[PDB]
Structure formats: C-alpha cells, structure tokens
C-alpha cells in the first residue's frame, strides 16, 4: 500500500519548462508530458517536461500525434534524458490544483499503464513573482473507498501538506485524488547557476552613474522633500492634538507625510552615498 | 544481423581518374549503390551512414537505414583534394559510437583507392584502438595496387590479430566498373 | 451496390463526426 511520505523531486528544468509552457498556453488548458524516474517506493524524480503541439479548444485539449511523442521518446533516449514516462502535467490557469473529469480519466489511463504514474497541475495565472502555484496528484481507488480502505498510511508528519486548499476539496480533493508533496533538488551546478542568474557584471559594478543626471535627480528629490516637509509640518501641527485617535489611520486615506519623507530620504541616501563612494574608489583605484 | 555500417569514400583528385569504366567517381557510385542494396536486403533495420574523405574529411549522412538519401547525396560530389584518412577513420568510429541502435554490430567500410601517405606505426596503433573498441573494418582499394596495398594488409592483419576475421581487404586491379568484384567479394559473399 | 452504400455511409459518418465536433465548442462573451 502506498505511503504518505511519497515525494516528487522535480528538476528546476522541469519546473521552468512546465511554467513557461502553461503561461504560453493561457487560457488553453495546455498539456505536456514529463520524463522522470521511480527511484524507490517513497520518491519519484522528475527530470524534464516537453509540451505537445496540439492546440485544441478554449475549454479542452487533445492528444494529436502519438507518433510525435514516440519519436521524441526514442530520440531523447538517444541523447538528452534516457528516462521514460512517469506522468503528465497540464495548466489550469485560474482554477487551483484540481483534476477535472477528463483529467481523472486521463490519469486512470496513466495508472492503468503504470500503477504509480503521476499527474501535475500548474497555475501560471496564480503562480506569483515568488511562491509558485503547483501540485501533484494521483487518483483514489473507488474499490478502496467502497471497501473502507484508506489512501495512504501516514507514517510521518508529512501529511499536513500545508492545509489542502478549499477549492481542491470542493473539486474533489481527497475524495478521488490526493495531493503529493513537491520538492526541488539541485546537484549544485544548477544551484550555483541559479545564483549566477541574477548576478550582474563588473561593467556596471564600477560604472559610476552619469553626474549631470544625478545632479538633476538630487534637485528633484530635494524639491519634493521640501513639499513633503511642508505637508508634514501641517500634519504634525495637530497630530495627536485635537485627538484623531478615533480618526486613527482613517484620518485621511491619502498622502502621509512621514512615509514619503522616509522613503525618499532613504533612496537619496542610497544614490548619493554609493555614487560618492564609487567616485572615491575609482579615483584611487585607477592609479 | 543487426548492422550499423559507416562507409567512407575517397574523392581525391586522383578519383578524377577513369581507369575503371566509365570513370572512378562513377565506379564509386556503383559500389555504394550495390553495397546499400545488399545492406537493405540484409536485416532492414540495419542502418547506414556516409563520409567523404578529402582535405577536411567531411561527413555526408549520419546513420540511417535509408539508401535513397545516401545515393542522392553521394551523387552531388566531385573529386578534389587528397585523402586525409586517419582523421576520416576516427570520425567514422565516433559516428559508429554515437549510433542509436547499440545492439547493432559496428562495421566500417572504406573506399580507399589512392596512395596512402600514412605512418604504419600510427596505422597499427589505430588498429589496436579500433579492435579494442570492437568495430570491424573492410577496405575496398582500387588503383594503387602497390603504393598502399602492403600498408593496408598490415593494418588488416593488425585488426584481425589472430582471429579477427571481421576485418577484410579487397584490392581490385585495373579493369571494368567496381561491381563484379564487390558482388563476388568475401565481404558480401559472406552475406 | 457496394460502392454506393459505402459512399452514403461515409457521407453520413463525415456529417455526424463534424456535428459532434461542432457540439463541443462553447461560446464566448
């Protein structure tokens, strides 16, 4: 009987391809296959995901070229990834992470082929500039439900699964399909790579910002500072006096003096200080 | 048998020759056609690929069981430069290595009618490398019946060791098209 | 009447399949 602690370690490559494909495919419930591997009874390793040329209808999608897929499989065996199918994924742009009826049927087929297949869902609409809305799934056996058996033995505390979503519950979560825990593992190369991605070049690292633009920038910032000081003086002219405590934040829903003052003073700190430092450092380092 | 066959073909300026009727290039065309047909009549899945040997020892078609593309591409060729060999053989060996069908036995055949300007010591070392890499070679020589026949005999003996019959030599004297020899040759007679 | 019956059946198959495909395309707003 399957275990609760089952994990799916998805390669960063796989995640990026999934998300890019789905974001391209919005709103179409675009679909793709992935090659991974079943290392053991507690883990599934997902390596790569490649899409499907099919472009069906604005409510549904369909497999077009089994020949396409078989050829991709053979060739990737030749070079690329000698993995072989472990599941499939499709975007649900703005629905959560639940499986429609057709989704469940496709799965049923996948499991019939390989009892431990996996389905995957991604929400490029919802996946934020930060956390990413994704999940994995495997069906629930109606035979087990009728017999009273249970999906997985939870020989762990890895069954919290971060508060299964109400939407997934509604659409059928844990009554026909159950979530699984995703993870990201890096063999240090992609890891330090990821680190490199944002890192910028010493070109700029030493490139002092032009100084005429900087002088004008300071001029503008000091002007807006003067005005913010005026309105701040007016605001403090009463502040607690005349007791806006009941007014609280609702004293005015606009134009807080202090917050703007601190924001702009901080930014002009940054600008002026670092530019002066770069000036000093260059003057002295190029000799 | 499952066979992945690489074939190298010389196109040196000597292949401008015409000692073989109608001409050397057309004799090579005939030889490639007959060999491709023989391989096709062999296990169809058997795969084929092509290399031309010149100043830069270029490659024409990677592995494929087709022969139409083989012959078509081979048609668009003219004799130029001098055989560089060595590099050609190494490229062909790498080709056989990067073959999709690993089960297929690895077989190289080289149309090498020309004078070979090679060091026999390096020929022997390459023979060692290739035999240890488990690939069998068959040479088809025409023209220089004296300049390089001894060198190729030594190379083939090296490849064979004491029992490596998979290595084969076929040197043809001046005469008609290079068809009758190939058809009644051991390399295809065994087939 | 083999060819004629086959042709009529094929026409029916074509139209029926096209209608089913048509039935599976919701509208927009």
Curated annotation (Swiss-Prot), chain A:
GO terms for molecular function: endopeptidase activator activity; K63-linked deubiquitinase activity; metal ion binding; metal-dependent deubiquitinase activity; metallopeptidase activity; proteasome binding. SUPFAM superfamilies: JAB1/MPN domain (SSF102712). A motif (JAMM motif) lies at residues 90-103. The modification Phosphothreonine is found at residue 243. It comes from Homo sapiens (Human). Zn(2+) binds at residues 90, 92, 103. It comes from the Eukaryota. GO terms for biological process: double-strand break repair via homologous recombination; double-strand break repair via nonhomologous end joining; proteasome-mediated ubiquitin-dependent protein catabolic process; protein deubiquitination; protein K63-linked deubiquitination; regulation of proteasomal protein catabolic process; response to ethanol; ubiquitin-dependent protein catabolic process. Disulfide bonds: none annotated. Its EC number is 3.4.19.-. This is 26S proteasome non-ATPase regulatory subunit 14. Residues 8-143 form the MPN domain. Component of the 26S proteasome, a multiprotein complex involved in the ATP-dependent degradation of ubiquitinated proteins. This complex plays a key role in the maintenance of protein homeostasis by removing misfolded or damaged proteins, which could impair cellular functions, and by removing proteins whose functions are no longer required. Therefore, the proteasome participates in numerous cellular processes, including cell cycle progression, apoptosis, or DNA damage repair. Belongs to the peptidase M67A family. PSMD14 subfamily. Component of the 19S proteasome regulatory particle complex. The 26S proteasome consists of a 20S core particle (CP) and two 19S regulatory subunits (RP). The regulatory particle is made of a lid composed of 9 subunits including PSMD4, a base containing 6 ATPases and few additional components. Within the complex, PSMD4 interacts with subunit PSMD7 through their respective MPN domain. Interacts with TXNL1. The modification Phosphoserine is found at residues 127, 201. One of its GO terms (cellular component) is nucleus. Pfam families: JAB, RPN11_C.
From Swiss-Prot, chain B:
The lineage of its organism: Eukaryota, Metazoa, Chordata, Craniata, Vertebrata. It comes from the Eukaryota. The keyword Ubl conjugation applies. The 2 UIM motifs are involved in the binding to a multi-ubiquitin chain in a cooperative way. One of its GO terms (biological process) is proteasome-mediated ubiquitin-dependent protein catabolic process. Residues 4-187 form the VWFA domain. Coiled coil: none annotated. Component of the 26S proteasome, a multiprotein complex involved in the ATP-dependent degradation of ubiquitinated proteins. This complex plays a key role in the maintenance of protein homeostasis by removing misfolded or damaged proteins, which could impair cellular functions, and by removing proteins whose functions are no longer required. Therefore, the proteasome participates in numerous cellular processes, including cell cycle progression, apoptosis, or DNA damage repair. Component of the 19S proteasome regulatory particle complex. The 26S proteasome consists of a 20S core particle (CP) and two 19S regulatory subunits (RP). The regulatory particle is made of a lid composed of 9 subunits, a base containing 6 ATPases and few additional components including PSMD4. Interacts with NUB1. Interacts with SQSTM1. Interacts with UBQLN4. Interacts with UBE3A. Interacts with UBQLN1 (via ubiquitin-like domain). Interacts with DDI2. It comes from Homo sapiens. Belongs to the proteasome subunit S5A family. There is a cross-link at residue 121 (Glycyl lysine isopeptide (Lys-Gly) (interchain with G-Cter in SUMO2)). One of its GO terms (molecular function) is identical protein binding. Keywords: Isopeptide bond, Phosphoprotein, Proteasome, Repeat, Ubl conjugation. One of its GO terms (cellular component) is nucleoplasm. The chain holds residues 2 to 192 of 377 of the full protein. This is 26S proteasome non-ATPase regulatory subunit 4. The keyword Repeat applies.
Swiss-Prot record, chain C:
Component of the 19S proteasome regulatory particle complex. The 26S proteasome consists of a 20S core particle (CP) and two 19S regulatory subunits (RP). The regulatory particle is made of a lid composed of 9 subunits, a base containing 6 ATPases including PSMC6 and few additional components. Interacts with PAAF1. It comes from the Eukaryota. Component of the 26S proteasome, a multiprotein complex involved in the ATP-dependent degradation of ubiquitinated proteins. This complex plays a key role in the maintenance of protein homeostasis by removing misfolded or damaged proteins, which could impair cellular functions, and by removing proteins whose functions are no longer required. Therefore, the proteasome participates in numerous cellular processes, including cell cycle progression, apoptosis, or DNA damage repair. Belongs to the AAA ATPase family. It is found in: Cytoplasm; Nucleus. Disulfide bonds: none annotated. The chain holds residues 28 to 56 of 389 of the full protein. The lineage of its organism: Eukaryota, Metazoa, Chordata, Craniata, Vertebrata. This is 26S proteasome regulatory subunit 10B.
């Amino acid at each position: 009987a399957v275990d609760t602690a089952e994990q799916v370690y998805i390669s960063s490559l796989a995640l990026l391809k999934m998300l890019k494909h789905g974001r391209a495919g919005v709103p179409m419930e675009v679909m793709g296959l992935m090659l991974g591997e079943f290392v053991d009874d507690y883990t599934v390793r997902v390596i790569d995901v490649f899409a499907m040329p099919q472009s069906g209808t604005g409510v549904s999608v369909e497999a077009v070229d089994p020949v396409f897929q078989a050829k991709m499989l053979d060739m990737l065996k030749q070079t690329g990834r000698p993995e072989m199918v472990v599941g499939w994924y499709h975007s649900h742009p703005g629905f959560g992470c639940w499986l429609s009826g057709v989704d469940i049927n496709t799965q049923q087929s996948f499991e019939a082929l390989s009892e431990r297949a996996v389905a995957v869902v991604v929400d490029p609409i919802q996946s934020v500039k930060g956390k990413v809305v994704i999940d994995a799934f495997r069906l629930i056996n109606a035979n087990m439900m009728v017999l009273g058996h249970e999906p997985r033995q939870t020989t762990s505390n890895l069954g919290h699964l971060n508060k299964p979503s109400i939407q997934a519950l509604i659409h059928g979560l844990n009554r026909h399909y159950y979530s699984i825990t995703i993870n990201y593992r890096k063999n240090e190369l992609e890891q330090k790579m990821l680190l490199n991605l944002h890192k910028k070049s010493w070109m700029e690292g030493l490139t002092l910002q032009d100084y005429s633009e900087h002088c004008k920038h300071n001029e503008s910032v000091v002007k807006e500072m003067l005005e913010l000081a005026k309105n701040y003086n007016k605001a403090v002219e009463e502040e607690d006096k005349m007791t806006p405590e009941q007014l609280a934040i609702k004293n005015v829903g606009k134009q807080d003096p202090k917050r703007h003052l601190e924001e702009h003073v901080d930014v002009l700190m940054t600008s002026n200080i670092v530019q002066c430092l770069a000036a000093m450092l260059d003057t002295v380092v190029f000799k | 048998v499952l066979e992945s066959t690489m074939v190298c073909v010389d196109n040196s300026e000597y292949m401008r020759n015409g000692d073989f009727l109608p001409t050397r290039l057309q004799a090579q065309q005939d030889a490639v056609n007959i060999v491709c047909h023989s391989k096709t009549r062999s296990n169809p899945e058997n795969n084929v690929g092509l290399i031309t040997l010149a100043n830069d020892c270029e490659v024409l078609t990677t592995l494929t069981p087709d022969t139409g593309r083989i012959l078509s591409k081979l048609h668009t060729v003219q004799p130029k430069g001098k055989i560089t060999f060595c590099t050609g053989i190494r490229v062909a060996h790498l080709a056989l290595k990067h073959r999709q069908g690993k089960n297929h036995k690895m077989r190289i055949i080289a149309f090498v009618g020309s004078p070979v300007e090679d060091n026999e010591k390096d020929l022997v070392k390459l023979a060692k490398r290739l035999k240890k890499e488990k690939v069998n070679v068959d040479i088809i020589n025409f023209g220089e019946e004296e300049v390089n026949t001894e060198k190729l005999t030594a190379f083939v003996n090296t490849l064979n060791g004491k029992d490596g019959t998979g290595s084969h030599l076929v040197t043809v004297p001046p005469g008609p098209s290079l068809a009758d020899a190939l058809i009644s040759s051991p390399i295809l007679a065994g087939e | 009447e083999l060819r004629e019956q086959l042709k009529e059946l094929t026409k029916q198959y074509e139209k029926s399949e096209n209608d089913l495909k048509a039935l599976q395309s919701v509208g927009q707003i």
